[PDB]
Design an enzyme around this catalytic site. Structure first.
Site, PDB file in Angstrom:
ATOM      1  N   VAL A   1      -9.268 -53.170 -23.490  1.00  0.00           N
ATOM      2  CA  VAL A   1     -10.402 -53.370 -22.596  1.00  0.00           C
ATOM      3  C   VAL A   1     -11.181 -52.068 -22.414  1.00  0.00           C
ATOM      4  CG1 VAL A   1     -11.095 -53.830 -20.220  1.00  0.00           C
ATOM      5  CG2 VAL A   1      -9.412 -55.299 -21.312  1.00  0.00           C
TER       6      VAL A   1
ATOM      7  N   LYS B   1     -18.889 -45.997 -18.554  1.00  0.00           N
ATOM      8  CA  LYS B   1     -19.370 -44.667 -18.183  1.00  0.00           C
ATOM      9  C   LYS B   1     -20.616 -44.188 -18.909  1.00  0.00           C
ATOM     10  CE  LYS B   1     -16.109 -45.220 -15.543  1.00  0.00           C
ATOM     11  NZ  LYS B   1     -15.603 -46.612 -15.325  1.00  0.00           N
TER      12      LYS B   1
ATOM     13  N   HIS C   1     -18.185 -18.430  -9.859  1.00  0.00           N
ATOM     14  CA  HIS C   1     -19.353 -18.644  -9.013  1.00  0.00           C
ATOM     15  C   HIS C   1     -20.632 -18.710  -9.849  1.00  0.00           C
ATOM     16  CE1 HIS C   1     -22.070 -18.281  -5.582  1.00  0.00           C
ATOM     17  NE2 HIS C   1     -22.712 -17.355  -6.271  1.00  0.00           N
TER      18      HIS C   1
HETATM   19  C1  LIG Z   1     -30.351 -12.716 -12.703  1.00  0.00           C
HETATM   20  C2  LIG Z   1     -28.872 -12.538 -12.337  1.00  0.00           C
HETATM   21  C3  LIG Z   1     -28.077 -13.679 -12.281  1.00  0.00           C
HETATM   22  C4  LIG Z   1     -26.693 -13.621 -11.947  1.00  0.00           C
HETATM   23  N1  LIG Z   1     -25.963 -14.804 -11.904  1.00  0.00           N
HETATM   24  C5  LIG Z   1     -24.590 -14.723 -11.560  1.00  0.00           C
HETATM   25  C6  LIG Z   1     -23.835 -15.935 -11.473  1.00  0.00           C
HETATM   26  O1  LIG Z   1     -24.306 -17.091 -11.684  1.00  0.00           O
HETATM   27  N2  LIG Z   1     -22.484 -15.791 -11.124  1.00  0.00           N
HETATM   28  C7  LIG Z   1     -21.888 -14.558 -10.874  1.00  0.00           C
HETATM   29  O2  LIG Z   1     -20.651 -14.568 -10.574  1.00  0.00           O
HETATM   30  N3  LIG Z   1     -22.615 -13.401 -10.934  1.00  0.00           N
HETATM   31  C8  LIG Z   1     -23.920 -13.502 -11.266  1.00  0.00           C
HETATM   32  N4  LIG Z   1     -24.704 -12.282 -11.319  1.00  0.00           N
HETATM   33  C9  LIG Z   1     -24.013 -11.014 -10.994  1.00  0.00           C
HETATM   34  C10 LIG Z   1     -23.778 -10.880  -9.482  1.00  0.00           C
HETATM   35  O3  LIG Z   1     -25.057 -11.024  -8.824  1.00  0.00           O
HETATM   36  C11 LIG Z   1     -23.121  -9.546  -9.144  1.00  0.00           C
HETATM   37  O4  LIG Z   1     -21.894  -9.495  -9.840  1.00  0.00           O
HETATM   38  C12 LIG Z   1     -22.830  -9.407  -7.643  1.00  0.00           C
HETATM   39  O5  LIG Z   1     -24.064  -9.472  -6.901  1.00  0.00           O
HETATM   40  C13 LIG Z   1     -22.172  -8.111  -7.327  1.00  0.00           C
HETATM   41  O6  LIG Z   1     -21.887  -8.106  -5.924  1.00  0.00           O
HETATM   42  P1  LIG Z   1     -21.781  -6.779  -5.097  1.00  0.00           P
HETATM   43  O7  LIG Z   1     -21.440  -7.170  -3.725  1.00  0.00           O
HETATM   44  O8  LIG Z   1     -20.860  -5.844  -5.830  1.00  0.00           O
HETATM   45  O9  LIG Z   1     -23.218  -6.099  -5.149  1.00  0.00           O
HETATM   46  P2  LIG Z   1     -24.725  -6.592  -4.974  1.00  0.00           P
HETATM   47  O10 LIG Z   1     -24.806  -8.046  -4.721  1.00  0.00           O
HETATM   48  O11 LIG Z   1     -25.466  -6.003  -6.129  1.00  0.00           O
HETATM   49  O12 LIG Z   1     -25.150  -5.903  -3.624  1.00  0.00           O
HETATM   50  C14 LIG Z   1     -25.203  -4.480  -3.427  1.00  0.00           C
HETATM   51  C15 LIG Z   1     -25.908  -4.275  -2.087  1.00  0.00           C
HETATM   52  O13 LIG Z   1     -25.623  -2.919  -1.685  1.00  0.00           O
HETATM   53  C16 LIG Z   1     -26.768  -2.405  -1.028  1.00  0.00           C
HETATM   54  N5  LIG Z   1     -26.650  -0.950  -1.071  1.00  0.00           N
HETATM   55  C17 LIG Z   1     -26.647  -0.131  -2.185  1.00  0.00           C
HETATM   56  N6  LIG Z   1     -26.519   1.152  -1.899  1.00  0.00           N
HETATM   57  C18 LIG Z   1     -26.431   1.189  -0.521  1.00  0.00           C
HETATM   58  C19 LIG Z   1     -26.277   2.258   0.425  1.00  0.00           C
HETATM   59  N7  LIG Z   1     -26.183   3.542   0.042  1.00  0.00           N
HETATM   60  N8  LIG Z   1     -26.225   1.955   1.744  1.00  0.00           N
HETATM   61  C20 LIG Z   1     -26.318   0.635   2.134  1.00  0.00           C
HETATM   62  N9  LIG Z   1     -26.460  -0.437   1.330  1.00  0.00           N
HETATM   63  C21 LIG Z   1     -26.514  -0.100  -0.014  1.00  0.00           C
HETATM   64  C22 LIG Z   1     -27.932  -3.022  -1.790  1.00  0.00           C
HETATM   65  O14 LIG Z   1     -29.175  -2.955  -1.088  1.00  0.00           O
HETATM   66  C23 LIG Z   1     -27.432  -4.414  -2.151  1.00  0.00           C
HETATM   67  O15 LIG Z   1     -27.923  -5.442  -1.331  1.00  0.00           O
HETATM   68  C24 LIG Z   1     -26.095 -12.330 -11.659  1.00  0.00           C
HETATM   69  C25 LIG Z   1     -26.911 -11.198 -11.721  1.00  0.00           C
HETATM   70  C26 LIG Z   1     -28.302 -11.258 -12.058  1.00  0.00           C
HETATM   71  C27 LIG Z   1     -29.075  -9.965 -12.094  1.00  0.00           C
HETATM   72  C1  LIG Z   2     -15.451 -52.618 -16.302  1.00  0.00           C
HETATM   73  C2  LIG Z   2     -14.150 -51.797 -16.332  1.00  0.00           C
HETATM   74  C3  LIG Z   2     -14.241 -50.396 -16.238  1.00  0.00           C
HETATM   75  C4  LIG Z   2     -13.076 -49.561 -16.265  1.00  0.00           C
HETATM   76  N1  LIG Z   2     -13.224 -48.184 -16.180  1.00  0.00           N
HETATM   77  C5  LIG Z   2     -12.053 -47.384 -16.220  1.00  0.00           C
HETATM   78  C6  LIG Z   2     -12.179 -45.964 -16.160  1.00  0.00           C
HETATM   79  O1  LIG Z   2     -13.265 -45.347 -16.075  1.00  0.00           O
HETATM   80  N2  LIG Z   2     -10.991 -45.234 -16.206  1.00  0.00           N
HETATM   81  C7  LIG Z   2      -9.740 -45.819 -16.300  1.00  0.00           C
HETATM   82  O2  LIG Z   2      -8.737 -45.030 -16.325  1.00  0.00           O
HETATM   83  N3  LIG Z   2      -9.607 -47.178 -16.374  1.00  0.00           N
HETATM   84  C8  LIG Z   2     -10.742 -47.915 -16.333  1.00  0.00           C
HETATM   85  N4  LIG Z   2     -10.617 -49.347 -16.421  1.00  0.00           N
HETATM   86  C9  LIG Z   2      -9.251 -49.897 -16.551  1.00  0.00           C
HETATM   87  C10 LIG Z   2      -8.681 -49.702 -17.951  1.00  0.00           C
HETATM   88  O3  LIG Z   2      -9.568 -50.347 -18.892  1.00  0.00           O
HETATM   89  C11 LIG Z   2      -7.273 -50.270 -18.015  1.00  0.00           C
HETATM   90  O4  LIG Z   2      -6.487 -49.575 -17.050  1.00  0.00           O
HETATM   91  C12 LIG Z   2      -6.653 -50.072 -19.397  1.00  0.00           C
HETATM   92  O5  LIG Z   2      -7.450 -50.756 -20.386  1.00  0.00           O
HETATM   93  C13 LIG Z   2      -5.276 -50.623 -19.454  1.00  0.00           C
HETATM   94  O6  LIG Z   2      -4.778 -50.335 -20.761  1.00  0.00           O
HETATM   95  P1  LIG Z   2      -3.665 -51.191 -21.430  1.00  0.00           P
HETATM   96  O7  LIG Z   2      -3.395 -50.569 -22.730  1.00  0.00           O
HETATM   97  O8  LIG Z   2      -2.528 -51.343 -20.445  1.00  0.00           O
HETATM   98  O9  LIG Z   2      -4.263 -52.647 -21.654  1.00  0.00           O
HETATM   99  P2  LIG Z   2      -5.633 -53.247 -22.217  1.00  0.00           P
HETATM  100  O10 LIG Z   2      -6.609 -52.191 -22.586  1.00  0.00           O
HETATM  101  O11 LIG Z   2      -6.034 -54.346 -21.278  1.00  0.00           O
HETATM  102  O12 LIG Z   2      -5.134 -53.828 -23.594  1.00  0.00           O
HETATM  103  C14 LIG Z   2      -4.170 -54.870 -23.731  1.00  0.00           C
HETATM  104  C15 LIG Z   2      -4.405 -55.452 -25.120  1.00  0.00           C
HETATM  105  O13 LIG Z   2      -3.261 -56.276 -25.389  1.00  0.00           O
HETATM  106  C16 LIG Z   2      -3.681 -57.363 -26.185  1.00  0.00           C
HETATM  107  N5  LIG Z   2      -2.672 -58.404 -26.031  1.00  0.00           N
HETATM  108  C17 LIG Z   2      -2.387 -59.131 -24.895  1.00  0.00           C
HETATM  109  N6  LIG Z   2      -1.419 -60.002 -25.061  1.00  0.00           N
HETATM  110  C18 LIG Z   2      -1.038 -59.850 -26.377  1.00  0.00           C
HETATM  111  C19 LIG Z   2      -0.044 -60.487 -27.187  1.00  0.00           C
HETATM  112  N7  LIG Z   2       0.756 -61.449 -26.706  1.00  0.00           N
HETATM  113  N8  LIG Z   2       0.083 -60.099 -28.476  1.00  0.00           N
HETATM  114  C20 LIG Z   2      -0.740 -59.106 -28.970  1.00  0.00           C
HETATM  115  N9  LIG Z   2      -1.698 -58.447 -28.295  1.00  0.00           N
HETATM  116  C21 LIG Z   2      -1.809 -58.865 -26.973  1.00  0.00           C
HETATM  117  C22 LIG Z   2      -5.068 -57.693 -25.664  1.00  0.00           C
HETATM  118  O14 LIG Z   2      -5.837 -58.441 -26.593  1.00  0.00           O
HETATM  119  C23 LIG Z   2      -5.640 -56.354 -25.231  1.00  0.00           C
HETATM  120  O15 LIG Z   2      -6.627 -55.840 -26.090  1.00  0.00           O
HETATM  121  C24 LIG Z   2     -11.775 -50.181 -16.390  1.00  0.00           C
HETATM  122  C25 LIG Z   2     -11.716 -51.575 -16.481  1.00  0.00           C
HETATM  123  C26 LIG Z   2     -12.875 -52.416 -16.457  1.00  0.00           C
HETATM  124  C27 LIG Z   2     -12.668 -53.905 -16.564  1.00  0.00           C
END
Ligand SMILES: Cc1cc2nc3c(=O)[nH]c(=O)nc-3n(C[C@H](O)[C@H](O)[C@H](O)COP(=O)(O)OP(=O)(O)OC[C@H]3O[C@@H](n4cnc5c(N)ncnc54)[C@H](O)[C@@H]3O)c2cc1C
Ligand SMILES: Cc1cc2nc3c(=O)[nH]c(=O)nc-3n(C[C@H](O)[C@H](O)[C@H](O)COP(=O)(O)OP(=O)(O)OC[C@H]3O[C@@H](n4cnc5c(N)ncnc54)[C@H](O)[C@@H]3O)c2cc1C
Ligand SMILES: COc1ccc(C(=O)N2CCC3(CC2)C(=O)N(CC(=O)NCCc2ccc(Cl)cc2Cl)CN3c2ccccc2)c(OC)c1
Ligand SMILES: COc1ccc(C(=O)N2CCC3(CC2)C(=O)N(CC(=O)NCCc2ccc(Cl)cc2Cl)CN3c2ccccc2)c(OC)c1
EC number: 1.8.1.4
Lengths: 464, 463
Positions: free
Chosen positions: A40, A50, A443
């Site tokens: 199934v 899905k 982060h």
């Molecule tokens: C465009 C961009 C995107 C990023 N995206 C990510 C991300 O998605 N994930 C991630 O994990 N990291 C990301 N980073 C990196 C992350 O921003 C840095 O690792 C993080 O900010 C470092 O933290 P921090 O506290 O060490 O310093 P900062 O956040 O750089 O802060 C230092 C602070 O100290 C102050 N300061 C400096 N000197 C003095 C002083 N003498 N007296 C008082 N205050 C002072 C400043 O004014 C400043 O505000 C990114 C960086 C950039 C540039």
């Molecule tokens: C709309 C829908 C969405 C779902 N979405 C999810 C999901 O996102 N995640 C999830 O984990 N589960 C989901 N499920 C449940 C999942 O499909 C079942 O848990 C899973 O299929 C069970 O697996 P199974 O192998 O036990 O049996 P089944 O997949 O039901 O297979 C049993 C098979 O045995 C065969 N059979 C039966 N009797 C005999 C026989 N006497 N001789 C030979 N063959 C036989 C059948 O023809 C059948 O194909 C969903 C179910 C439905 C209905």
């Protein structure tokens, strides 16, 4: 009569995986399936499901947040295309199963299997032929079938997930019986594609198996989405009059009739246990008419195992697979690890925002007697959530005070189904909130919300 | 005016360290003259990820409108994307001030300069000048942009600051540095119709990642339309008003590149001069970064250094973690050293994401470990296909002794969220065998990790 060390019944997620594991452990294997290779899940469940959820998710965005995202222009969406894409994905996975059966030298039997003895299986080949096979061990992965509302029946407009999922055209309106994940997902998709949606649930809350806080949030989300959900309402009858379907529901001695083009039956799924001679094998059933099984997936018949939905422990694909592996390893006498308490297994609902949980809910842990400690962190306080455009939802962790051990996790938010691994891993290998709080999270990500709860569990959160 | 702890800088490291310190009952004061929340919340992390999200939607539509049955003529307005990024930024900055009051931490609006090993001279923003003593000090002064040797900033030669605070976009741009920051700008700008050229001195893009990741990411960027020049050295930058000319050297030959703007993002140097580190006696390393021990403790016992200023791993979550360690060490509370910083997670947020931790395959082999590699492609993952992007992979590196993890490297749709399980396992000695028993919900990207675990332990199942 061909003889195999092992023979599996059903090619679903549990069956085909149990065969693969058997083959790896050097076990002569043969798998019997008459219709669905991949069962199934791959054919009309998980897989196509899905893909549709993803299409609906886009319609949701390019419709409610288009302006907020600086997107302008009148665009339309064709569900037909979404349908076609889901079928291709399904086809791909299904083709992939045969590849795996081939790669592992697994013998494929195309037909319906019926036990004629504890070690003999008669098959009714799809080409009319007939062949019987012997085996030292057998793995029953027959799956489950949709349970219908008592008294009701299927028809042109009253259907199961199958007829609906395979429907390229969408109805004008629909009534879904059952507010479980399956029901809620069809609701999310259909509603987004413009279908009138009403979901009826006997129980007091939608997704009744989840934690109470999760049911409320999700119900609030759906109401906003425009979906009508009636809780604590009993579906009495279902009448398909052709041009439309009439469903009568009751709540507090007051009845009302709901009407729509179609009605989806999704209140539950009963294990496929009749029609293939379980009695001749001597395999006993539980009171809920599910195949009884022990911690190693063994039935009351030593060499016969039961895995997947057919045992009704946790009707999910990953569980079926996992039990399949356990059955295989146990047969081969190889090292294995029982799944243990199935309540601890992870699960997710893929509407958007997602619902992901594992373990016990706050209230269950309360009743179970634990010294409950709770830590809830809202996504409105998460950098990544705001960056993605959906700061709703939360992360709720339940734990015991003595050592800060995890009891359960309950999350509602953008794609939160991918955040569970860390939780279940820690729970399984005795890692507490103390060790959890020391894991640095990148982060900015949704996962940082888990770090905060770990801190609010050990003491008090930092960014809160 | 004396405090138990005084924090210099209010970025991710400083403000988080102050909170932890306050929680431990330590009177705390934090000094910041411009950016509360630092670079990250004001002109870094926060607005950046917001813009990346917008660019993703533009991509999703453009590249896959048809594949999703979405038809129609839509247009995207960067100005609006810009506007939202500022709002998301201002929201977080306001959150910093909230937590400061809630924890009764004292805010000092000025610049701090050390006078003693326990005395700070503050130049208040209002013009006044005051002094402050302390028993412990945390230096979180972050880093600044390292300009290409011999070049300088100008009207059209900017840093990430000017570029990210720009509501209008140029017609073309050249980016110096194929690091995450540059790559992210390339992603955003390209999706919004800007001609993008990225120049990288080293032979691969994202040179700090695993070679397989660099290769894969370069491919997708080329498909995006971004021209990347590797093993190419920027010789000089000439701002000519109308067009900027970047003279570069590739394969022993000098050639010119032209665009309207040029972004300088090859690296970031720890802010170490101008505020009297010498007066306090703090020592810098060979690379001119404040040296610290496993407790963020400088050569001066009661003085600590966290964040980018120590240059160990210049990231916000790293900055936050060290601050916690510093505050706990100061109060003498229960603490755990971060350990080998190479084992810390990192992600690049272009789409698909890049997520990794630990050693690359080559590094592990060079380190002398008994390398074991398991790689799984998302083309075999149900969720990836459902998402509409089965590209990428998951590559895990472990030692054959007991199957302990050494590193994780992936590229795929939002893979940044998948690191938790891996770093947790590597941190508390959970090997492949233990990890291979953790069940992963279906259908999710995380399942890819699951397969890799089986691969390490023996044989994958769905591949
Ligand atoms: C465009 C961009 C995107 C990023 N995206 C990510 C991300 O998605 N994930 C991630 O994990 N990291 C990301 N980073 C990196 C992350 O921003 C840095 O690792 C993080 O900010 C470092 O933290 P921090 O506290 O060490 O310093 P900062 O956040 O750089 O802060 C230092 C602070 O100290 C102050 N300061 C400096 N000197 C003095 C002083 N003498 N007296 C008082 N205050 C002072 C400043 O004014 C400043 O505000 C990114 C960086 C950039 C540039
Ligand atoms: C709309 C829908 C969405 C779902 N979405 C999810 C999901 O996102 N995640 C999830 O984990 N589960 C989901 N499920 C449940 C999942 O499909 C079942 O848990 C899973 O299929 C069970 O697996 P199974 O192998 O036990 O049996 P089944 O997949 O039901 O297979 C049993 C098979 O045995 C065969 N059979 C039966 N009797 C005999 C026989 N006497 N001789 C030979 N063959 C036989 C059948 O023809 C059948 O194909 C969903 C179910 C439905 C209905
Ligand atoms: C997106 O993928 C999906 C598709 C379906 C469900 C779902 O609604 N389920 C399956 C799991 C369920 C409840 C019903 C189960 O089958 N279990 C046993 C069970 O509920 N009992 C059923 C057994 C049974 C009862 C009566 C009778 Cl007569 C027979 C049987 Cl076999 C546990 N369980 C669950 C528990 C907690 C939180 C979430 C889910 C789901 O949920 C997240 C996700
Ligand atoms: C989306 O969020 C972002 C924003 C920036 C980067 C980035 O390009 N970095 C930070 C991490 C980095 C390399 C540079 C580092 O600072 N490290 C130490 C380092 O190289 N030290 C440099 C400090 C320094 C610089 C200049 C001078 Cl003059 C002195 C010093 Cl001490 C290692 N490291 C890294 C990146 C990816 C994979 C593995 C490791 C990033 O990368 C994923 C993500």
């Amino acid at each position: 009569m061909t003889h195999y060390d092992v023979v599996v019944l059903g090619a679903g997620p549990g069956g085909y995986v149990a065969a693969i594991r058997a083959a790896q452990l050097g076990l002569s294997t043969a798998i019997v399936e008459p219709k669905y290779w991949g069962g199934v899940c791959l054919n009309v469940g998980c897989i196509p499901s899905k893909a549709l959820l993803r299409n609906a998710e886009l319609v949701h965005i390019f419709t409610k947040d288009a302006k907020a995202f600086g997107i302008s222009g009148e665009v339309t969406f064709d569900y037909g295309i979404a349908y076609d894409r889901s079928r291709k994905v399904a086809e791909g996975r299904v083709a992939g199963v045969h590849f795996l059966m081939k790669k592992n030298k697994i013998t494929e039997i195309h037909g319906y299997g019926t036990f004629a003895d504890a070690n003999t299986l008669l098959v009714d080949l799809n080409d009319g032929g007939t062949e019987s096979v012997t085996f030292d061990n057998a793995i029953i992965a027959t799956g489950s079938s949709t349970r219908l509302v008592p008294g009701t029946s299927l028809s042109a407009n009253v259907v199961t997930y199958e007829e609906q999922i395979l429907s390229r055209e969408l109805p004008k309106s629909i009534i879904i019986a059952g507010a479980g994940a399956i029901g809620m997902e069809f609701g999310y998709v259909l509603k987004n594609y413009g279908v009138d949606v009403t979901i009826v649930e006997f129980l007091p809350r939608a997704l009744p198996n989840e934690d109470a806080d999760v049911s409320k949030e999700i119900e609030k989300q759906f109401k906003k989405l425009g979906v009508t959900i009636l809780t604590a309402t009993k579906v009495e009858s279902i009448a398909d009059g052709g041009s439309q379907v009439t469903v009568t529901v009751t709540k507090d001695g007051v009845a009302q009739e709901l009407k729509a083009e179609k009605v989806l039956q999704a209140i539950g799924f009963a294990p496929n246990v009749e029609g293939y001679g379980l009695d001749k094998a001597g395999v006993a059933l539980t009171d809920r008419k599910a195949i009884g099984v022990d911690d190693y997936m063994r039935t009351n018949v030593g060499h016969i195992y039961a895995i997947g939905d057919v045992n009704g422990l946790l009707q999910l694909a990953h569980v079926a697979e996992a039990q399949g592996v356990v059955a295989a390893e146990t047969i081969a006498g190889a090292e294995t690890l029982t799944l243990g308490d199935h309540r601890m297994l992870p699960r997710a609902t893929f509407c958007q925002p997602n619902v992901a949980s594992f373990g016990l809910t706050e209230q269950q842990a309360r009743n179970e007697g634990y010294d409950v400690v709770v830590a809830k962190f809202p996504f409105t306080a998460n950098a990544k959530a705001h960056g993605v455009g959906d700061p709703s939802g939360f992360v709720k962790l339940v734990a015991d005070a003595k050592h800060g051990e995890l009891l359960g996790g309950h999350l509602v938010g953008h794609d939160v189904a991918e955040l569970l691994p860390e939780l279940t891993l820690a729970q399984r290998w005795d890692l507490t909130a103390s060790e959890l709080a020391r894991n640095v999270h990148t982060h900015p990500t949704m996962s940082e919300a888990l770090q905060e709860c770990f801190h609010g569990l050990v003491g008090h959160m930092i960014n809160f």
